[PDB]
Design a protein around this motif. Structure first.
Motif, PDB file in Angstrom:
ATOM      1  N   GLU A   6       0.836  -1.191   0.000  1.00 42.93           N
ATOM      2  CA  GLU A   6       0.000   0.000   0.000  1.00 42.93           C
ATOM      3  C   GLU A   6       0.875   1.246   0.000  1.00 42.93           C
ATOM      4  O   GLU A   6       1.829   1.350   0.775  1.00 42.93           O
ATOM      5  CB  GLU A   6      -0.921  -0.001   1.223  1.00 42.93           C
ATOM      6  CG  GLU A   6      -1.797   1.242   1.335  1.00 42.93           C
ATOM      7  CD  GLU A   6      -2.673   1.242   2.572  1.00 42.93           C
ATOM      8  OE1 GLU A   6      -3.267   2.302   2.871  1.00 42.93           O
ATOM      9  OE2 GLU A   6      -2.766   0.193   3.249  1.00 42.93           O
ATOM     10  N   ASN A  57      -7.879   5.670  -0.144  1.00 45.53           N
ATOM     11  CA  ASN A  57      -8.830   4.581   0.019  1.00 45.53           C
ATOM     12  C   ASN A  57     -10.135   4.948  -0.681  1.00 45.53           C
ATOM     13  O   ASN A  57     -10.741   5.981  -0.376  1.00 45.53           O
ATOM     14  CB  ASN A  57      -9.045   4.342   1.506  1.00 45.53           C
ATOM     15  CG  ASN A  57      -9.866   3.121   1.800  1.00 45.53           C
ATOM     16  OD1 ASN A  57     -10.823   2.795   1.090  1.00 45.53           O
ATOM     17  ND2 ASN A  57      -9.499   2.429   2.863  1.00 45.53           N
ATOM     18  N   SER A  59     -13.010   3.825  -0.394  1.00 44.25           N
ATOM     19  CA  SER A  59     -14.155   3.851   0.506  1.00 44.25           C
ATOM     20  C   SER A  59     -14.143   5.050   1.446  1.00 44.25           C
ATOM     21  O   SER A  59     -15.033   5.162   2.292  1.00 44.25           O
ATOM     22  CB  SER A  59     -14.202   2.561   1.326  1.00 44.25           C
ATOM     23  OG  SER A  59     -14.314   1.432   0.478  1.00 44.25           O
ATOM     24  N   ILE A  60     -13.162   5.940   1.319  1.00 47.12           N
ATOM     25  CA  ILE A  60     -13.012   7.086   2.207  1.00 47.12           C
ATOM     26  C   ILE A  60     -12.970   8.355   1.370  1.00 47.12           C
ATOM     27  O   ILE A  60     -12.388   8.372   0.281  1.00 47.12           O
ATOM     28  CB  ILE A  60     -11.737   6.966   3.072  1.00 47.12           C
ATOM     29  CG1 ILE A  60     -11.840   5.749   3.996  1.00 47.12           C
ATOM     30  CG2 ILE A  60     -11.508   8.253   3.882  1.00 47.12           C
ATOM     31  CD1 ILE A  60     -10.589   5.483   4.827  1.00 47.12           C
ATOM     32  N   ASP A 137      -8.707  -1.580  -2.507  1.00 41.18           N
ATOM     33  CA  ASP A 137      -9.382  -0.313  -2.262  1.00 41.18           C
ATOM     34  C   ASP A 137      -8.409   0.838  -2.033  1.00 41.18           C
ATOM     35  O   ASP A 137      -8.829   1.999  -2.069  1.00 41.18           O
ATOM     36  CB  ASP A 137     -10.334  -0.428  -1.058  1.00 41.18           C
ATOM     37  CG  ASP A 137      -9.676  -1.044   0.160  1.00 41.18           C
ATOM     38  OD1 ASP A 137      -8.431  -1.031   0.250  1.00 41.18           O
ATOM     39  OD2 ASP A 137     -10.411  -1.542   1.037  1.00 41.18           O
ATOM     40  N   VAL A 138      -7.128   0.547  -1.816  1.00 43.69           N
ATOM     41  CA  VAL A 138      -6.096   1.569  -1.664  1.00 43.69           C
ATOM     42  C   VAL A 138      -5.060   1.382  -2.767  1.00 43.69           C
ATOM     43  O   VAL A 138      -4.902   0.268  -3.283  1.00 43.69           O
ATOM     44  CB  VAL A 138      -5.438   1.501  -0.277  1.00 43.69           C
ATOM     45  CG1 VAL A 138      -6.432   1.882   0.809  1.00 43.69           C
ATOM     46  CG2 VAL A 138      -4.871   0.111  -0.025  1.00 43.69           C
TER      47      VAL A 138
HETATM   48  C1  LIG Z   1     -10.305   1.303   3.186  1.00 41.46           C
HETATM   49  O1  LIG Z   1     -11.279   1.845   4.023  1.00 41.46           O
HETATM   50  C2  LIG Z   1     -12.337   0.963   4.353  1.00 41.46           C
HETATM   51  C3  LIG Z   1     -13.369   1.816   5.028  1.00 41.46           C
HETATM   52  O2  LIG Z   1     -13.509   1.437   6.310  1.00 41.46           O
HETATM   53  C4  LIG Z   1     -13.184   2.456   7.293  1.00 41.46           C
HETATM   54  O3  LIG Z   1     -13.430   1.909   8.576  1.00 41.46           O
HETATM   55  C5  LIG Z   1     -12.966   2.667   9.704  1.00 41.46           C
HETATM   56  C6  LIG Z   1     -11.580   2.120  10.039  1.00 41.46           C
HETATM   57  C7  LIG Z   1     -12.999   4.178   9.412  1.00 41.46           C
HETATM   58  O4  LIG Z   1     -11.775   4.568   8.843  1.00 41.46           O
HETATM   59  C8  LIG Z   1     -14.155   4.503   8.445  1.00 41.46           C
HETATM   60  O5  LIG Z   1     -14.142   5.917   8.222  1.00 41.46           O
HETATM   61  C9  LIG Z   1     -14.019   3.740   7.108  1.00 41.46           C
HETATM   62  O6  LIG Z   1     -15.296   3.484   6.543  1.00 41.46           O
HETATM   63  C10 LIG Z   1     -11.819  -0.254   5.163  1.00 41.46           C
HETATM   64  O7  LIG Z   1     -12.881  -1.179   5.309  1.00 41.46           O
HETATM   65  C11 LIG Z   1     -13.214  -1.469   6.696  1.00 41.46           C
HETATM   66  O8  LIG Z   1     -12.251  -2.134   7.436  1.00 41.46           O
HETATM   67  C12 LIG Z   1     -12.460  -2.148   8.852  1.00 41.46           C
HETATM   68  C13 LIG Z   1     -11.186  -2.468   9.580  1.00 41.46           C
HETATM   69  O9  LIG Z   1     -10.753  -3.698   9.055  1.00 41.46           O
HETATM   70  C14 LIG Z   1     -13.554  -3.236   9.030  1.00 41.46           C
HETATM   71  O10 LIG Z   1     -14.015  -3.496  10.371  1.00 41.46           O
HETATM   72  C15 LIG Z   1     -14.743  -4.817  10.547  1.00 41.46           C
HETATM   73  O11 LIG Z   1     -16.107  -4.781  11.032  1.00 41.46           O
HETATM   74  C16 LIG Z   1     -16.813  -6.053  10.967  1.00 41.46           C
HETATM   75  C17 LIG Z   1     -18.314  -5.846  11.027  1.00 41.46           C
HETATM   76  O12 LIG Z   1     -18.758  -5.501   9.719  1.00 41.46           O
HETATM   77  C18 LIG Z   1     -16.211  -7.030  11.997  1.00 41.46           C
HETATM   78  O13 LIG Z   1     -16.825  -8.277  11.784  1.00 41.46           O
HETATM   79  C19 LIG Z   1     -14.709  -7.036  11.607  1.00 41.46           C
HETATM   80  O14 LIG Z   1     -13.899  -7.972  12.346  1.00 41.46           O
HETATM   81  C20 LIG Z   1     -14.105  -5.622  11.651  1.00 41.46           C
HETATM   82  O15 LIG Z   1     -14.510  -4.913  12.818  1.00 41.46           O
HETATM   83  C21 LIG Z   1     -14.764  -2.773   8.265  1.00 41.46           C
HETATM   84  O16 LIG Z   1     -15.700  -3.837   8.228  1.00 41.46           O
HETATM   85  C22 LIG Z   1     -14.487  -2.287   6.855  1.00 41.46           C
HETATM   86  N1  LIG Z   1     -15.584  -1.441   6.566  1.00 41.46           N
HETATM   87  C23 LIG Z   1     -16.159  -1.361   5.418  1.00 41.46           C
HETATM   88  C24 LIG Z   1     -17.235  -0.355   5.356  1.00 41.46           C
HETATM   89  O17 LIG Z   1     -15.842  -2.004   4.477  1.00 41.46           O
HETATM   90  C25 LIG Z   1     -10.597  -0.863   4.532  1.00 41.46           C
HETATM   91  O18 LIG Z   1     -10.012  -1.688   5.493  1.00 41.46           O
HETATM   92  C26 LIG Z   1      -9.643   0.220   4.036  1.00 41.46           C
HETATM   93  N2  LIG Z   1      -8.616  -0.419   3.348  1.00 41.46           N
HETATM   94  C27 LIG Z   1      -7.428  -0.504   3.825  1.00 41.46           C
HETATM   95  C28 LIG Z   1      -6.516  -1.290   2.977  1.00 41.46           C
HETATM   96  O19 LIG Z   1      -7.085  -0.012   4.845  1.00 41.46           O
END
Ligand SMILES: *[C@@H]1O[C@H](CO[C@@H]2O[C@@H](C)[C@@H](O)[C@@H](O)[C@@H]2O)[C@@H](O[C@@H]2O[C@H](CO)[C@@H](O[C@@H]3O[C@H](CO)[C@@H](O)[C@H](O)[C@@H]3O)[C@H](O)[C@H]2NC(C)=O)[C@H](O)[C@H]1NC(C)=O
Ligand SMILES: *[C@@H]1O[C@H](CO[C@@H]2O[C@@H](C)[C@@H](O)[C@@H](O)[C@@H]2O)[C@@H](O[C@@H]2O[C@H](CO)[C@@H](O[C@@H]3O[C@H](CO[C@H]4O[C@H](CO)[C@@H](O)[C@H](O)[C@@H]4O)[C@@H](O)[C@H](O)[C@@H]3O)[C@H](O)[C@H]2NC(C)=O)[C@H](O)[C@H]1NC(C)=O
Length: 236
Positions: A6, A57, A59-60, A137-138
């Motif tokens: 990344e 990212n 998604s951000i 996504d990044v």
């Molecule tokens: C690119 O960004 C996305 C967006 O997710 C972000 O999540 C937070 C950390 C904040 O920064 C928000 O502003 C932002 O939407 C990342 O996707 C997300 O990853 C997180 C961390 O891994 C995931 O959390 C999971 O939640 C589930 C329940 O749904 C639990 O079962 C899991 O064990 C864990 O808590 C999250 O699900 C996921 N969110 C989405 C909306 O997809 C992504 O990681 C990031 N990419 C990189 C490479 O960093």
């Protein structure tokens, strides 16, 4: 990008991302070269794509992210004898300028010529695995080498002999650009020298380097268009 990691969040402030509107799907990348001009690859760009500056990212949405669209679309129409492989640029004028910010700044056209043996940074949201078509996504970043064009010529029979492409990669394999890295910049020794064009799929095979559009061939043409030249853009 295969074989890298990344990108650092601040090391691609010039990297533009193209999206369709509905569905909202990443298409490819481009390079911000001026507060209101982006340089991209002709083969992946199509009219009406959304242009995002300051995206990392997908998604951000950073607070300083900017969205634009092309109001002008300039293709290289100066030499009818050039094949499609020798003119894969599109110069886009943005509907409005973008000011510098944490995640936004333009990358200048090259001021010195490309040199064999340089270390080149590649970056993109393209396929990141040689065994699975995984899109991150990044953006991922990696280093490759600017190679003798001889290292590429034998692998692309369909591509005629030319001086308008750069050969770059890693001969042992493992590191390479891949699908949907198109349009991203190849930055060799700090200079914007190439645009991701095409290579081989599967990607990152040994002794299968990729070909990159040679930016420096277009400096005078781009600068004239930016300067307002309509006709007279090309050389006499
Ligand atoms: C690119 O960004 C996305 C967006 O997710 C972000 O999540 C937070 C950390 C904040 O920064 C928000 O502003 C932002 O939407 C990342 O996707 C997300 O990853 C997180 C961390 O891994 C995931 O959390 C999971 O939640 C589930 C329940 O749904 C639990 O079962 C899991 O064990 C864990 O808590 C999250 O699900 C996921 N969110 C989405 C909306 O997809 C992504 O990681 C990031 N990419 C990189 C490479 O960093
Ligand atoms: C918005 O940010 C860009 C700076 O671009 C960054 O440069 C530094 C700050 C790093 O953080 C990089 O990551 C970024 O790429 C500014 O545009 C740049 O301005 C600087 C001025 O310091 C120029 O860099 C110098 O260029 C000198 C020669 O300038 C002339 O030639 C170049 C073409 O090569 C041309 O772009 C410029 O307009 C002049 O024609 C050179 O002698 C010196 O050694 C150094 O390289 C750089 O050229 C500019 N880049 C671009 C892409 O325009 C903006 O100033 C800034 N906005 C503001 C007001 O903050």
């Amino acid at each position: 990008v295969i074989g890298g990691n990344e990108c650092d969040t601040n090391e691609h402030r010039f990297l533009a991302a193209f999206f369709t509107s509905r569905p909202w799907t990443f298409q490819c990348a481009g390079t911000l070269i001026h507060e209101e001009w982006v340089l991209a690859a002709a083969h992946c760009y199509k009219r009406g794509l959304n242009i995002y500056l300051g995206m990392h990212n997908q998604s951000i949405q950073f607070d300083d992210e900017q969205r634009r669209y092309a109001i002008e679309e300039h293709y290289y129409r100066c030499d009818e004898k050039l094949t499609k492989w020798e003119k894969d640029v599109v110069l886009l004028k943005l509907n409005k300028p973008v000011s510098n910010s944490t995640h936004i700044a333009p990358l200048s056209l090259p001021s010195s010529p490309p040199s064999i043996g340089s270390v080149c940074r590649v970056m993109g949201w393209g396929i990141m695995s040689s065994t699975k078509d995984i899109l991150p996504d990044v953006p991922h970043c990696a280093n490759i080498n600017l190679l003798n064009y001889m290292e590429c010529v034998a692998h692309y029979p369909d591509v005629p002999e030319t001086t308008r492409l750069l050969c770059a990669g890693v001969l042992e394999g493992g590191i390479d650009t891949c699908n949907q890295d198109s349009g991203g910049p190849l930055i060799c020794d700090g200079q914007f020298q190439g645009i991701v064009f095409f290579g081989k799929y599967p990607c990152a095979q040994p002794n299968k380097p990729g070909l990159y559009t040679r930016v420096s061939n277009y400096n005078d043409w781009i600068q004239n268009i930016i300067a307002g030249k309509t006709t007279t853009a090309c050389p006499p």
